[PDB]
A paper describes a structure:
The PD-1/PD-L1 immune checkpoint, which is one of the best characterized receptor ligands in immuno-oncology, involves PD-1 (programmed death protein 1, also known as CD279) and two known ligands PD-L1 ([name]; [name]) and PD-L2 (B7-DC; CD273). The binding of PD-1 to its PD-L1 ligand limits T-cell activity, thereby preventing excessive stimulation and maintaining immune tolerance to self-antigens. Here, we have screened and identified a specific high-affinity PD-L1 [name] (single domain antibody), designated KN035, which shows strong antitumor activity comparable to that of durvalumab, a fully humanized antibody developed by AstraZeneca showing promising readouts in multiple phase III clinical trials. To further investigate the molecular mechanism underlying the PD-L1/KN035 interaction, we solved crystal structures of KN035 complexed with an (IgV) N-terminal immunoglobulin-variable domain of PD-L1 at 1.7 Å resolution and with free PD-L1 at 2.7 Å resolution.
The crystal structure of the KN035/PD-L1 complex contains KN035 and the IgV domain of PD-L1 with 1:1 stoichiometry in the asymmetric unit. The CDR1 loop of KN035 forms a short alpha helix, whereas the CDR3 loop uniquely adopts a short alpha helix and a short 310 helix, which is not observed in other nanobodies. The short alpha helix of the CDR3 loop is connected to the CDR1 of KN035 by an additional disulfide bond (SS2: Cys38–Cys111.3), and the CDR3 loop is further stabilized through its hydrophobic interactions with the body of KN035. KN035 binds to the IgV domain of PD-L1 with its CDR1 and CDR3 packing against the surface formed by the CC’FG strands of PD-L1, with the burial of a total surface area of 1.245 Å2. A pronounced π–π stacking interaction is observed in which the Phe109 aromatic ring of KN035 is perpendicularly stacked with that of Tyr56 of PD-L1, which is further stabilized by other hydrophobic residues (Leu112.4, Val112.3, Ala114 and Phe115) in CDR3 of KN035 and Ile54, Val68 and Met115 of PD-L1. Furthermore, KN035 forms close to seven hydrogen bonds and two ionic bonds with PD-L1, involving nine KN035 residues and six PD-L1 residues. These polar interactions include strong salt bridges between Asp107 of KN035 and Arg113 of PD-L1, with the sidechains of both residues fully extended and stabilized by surrounding residues. Glu58 of PD-L1 forms two hydrogen bonds with Ser108 of KN035, and Gln66 in the C’ strand of PD-L1 forms three hydrogen bonds with the main chain or sidechain of Thr111.2 and Asp111 of KN035. Interestingly, although Asp61 in the connecting loop between strand C and C’ of PD-L1 moves ~2 Å towards KN035 and forms hydrogen bonds with Ser30 and Ser35 in the helix of the CDR1 loop, substitution of this residue with an Ala (Asp61Ala) reduces the binding affinity by merely sixfold.
Numbering used by the authors:
A (entry chain A): 18 to 132
B (entry chain B): 1 to 127
The structure:
Amino acid sequence: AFTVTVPKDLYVVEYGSNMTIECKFPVEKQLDLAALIVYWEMEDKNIIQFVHGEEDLKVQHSSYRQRARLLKDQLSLGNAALQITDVKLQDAGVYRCMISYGGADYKRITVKVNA
Amino acid sequence: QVQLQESGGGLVQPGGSLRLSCAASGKMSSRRCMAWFRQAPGKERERVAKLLTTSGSTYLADSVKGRFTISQNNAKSTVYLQMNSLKPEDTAMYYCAADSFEDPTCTLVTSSGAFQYWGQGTQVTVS
Ligand SMILES: [Cl-]
Ligand SMILES: [Cl-]
Ligand SMILES: [Cl-]
Ligand code: NA
Ligand code: NA
């Protein structure tokens, strides 16, 4: 069945640095955007919804809205990569990626932040 | 975290009706995306209904549009599937499922693999 994997389930990061966390999923020879959904959250708070080849436009000022982005050029290589810049103490916690691309699955990644 | 428990299954003749309930508990944000899935023996779980609890926005699979309805109570501790005009092909174990997905993802994700929380299932037989 469709399985999402992580190269690391824990990242330890320094305050003020930049961090990229990754989930991996099965590739086709051609990235079919119509079928792909990429969902990133921290705890239950949504960070990314990449649907139909489009990022869901957020209007609410939030912690993540200007510092978080999905590295879209990595999707065709089977990498869901979330880059968060200028890491803050509040960025510590449990992240989850859910990818749907035919089947669907999810994994969790913990981030610890040092100051 | 989240727990889900179904009730309401049974046996009806064609044209009959059943009402399923899913008693939902745990942090509301962790179960804002509610769904009903069904599994016939020899087949995969397939989604038939979706509700985002915060907006009330619902979605029904083409196979059940106009026959089934998904809803919740005021406290949002219970989610229902009202099943009218039942047909033999509706025979299956029915499951409630929950997760945290906001819309549009909640609407668009039909694979059972996406959902982390599940009820134990309830049998619906139409014969
Ligand atoms: Cl459909
Ligand atoms: Cl559906
Ligand atoms: Cl009510
Ligand atoms: Na490609
Ligand atoms: Na009520």
